[PDB]
């Protein structure tokens, strides 16, 4: 339905950064950079191991 893809997602991620704790704001960008480079069936263990972020943080971010 979006005639110009990705606008609302940009707006959503910015707001989701602004309301987090001040320790979290490096880890959010780490997760985004990790998801922008891997092959498309990512297990959570390798993602956590190469990012240093806990699994529950990734899961709550995605929810």
């Amino acid at each position: 339905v979006e005639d110009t893809i990705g606008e609302v997602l940009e707006k959503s991620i910015a707001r989701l950064r602004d309301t987090a704790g001040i320790s979290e704001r490096a880890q959010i960008d780490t997760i985004c950079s990790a998801l922008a480079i891997l092959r498309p069936l990512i297990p959570l263990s390798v993602l956590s191991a190469i990012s240093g972020v806990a699994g529950s943080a990734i899961k709550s971010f995605a929810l």
Partner: protein
């Protein structure tokens, strides 16, 4: 019935520079910009381009 009240803060960055130069962190504008005002009032600030991020706008702000 269509009147407005305008509040203007000139030199907004200087107030934050003076606060951080003596060991504080929260000048009045840095709190006031995130507060919710009644209807029919508008809030405008002015600053230099390279100092804008001292006062840290929220995502709703217009530039």
């Amino acid at each position: 019935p269509l009147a407005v009240l305008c509040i203007i803060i000139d030199a907004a960055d200087n107030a934050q520079m003076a606060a951080e130069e003596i060991g504080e962190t929260r000048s009045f504008i840095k709190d006031l910009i995130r507060e919710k005002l009644p209807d029919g009032v508008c809030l405008v600030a002015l600053c230099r381009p390279y100092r804008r991020e001292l006062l840290d706008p929220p995502p709703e702000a217009l530039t």
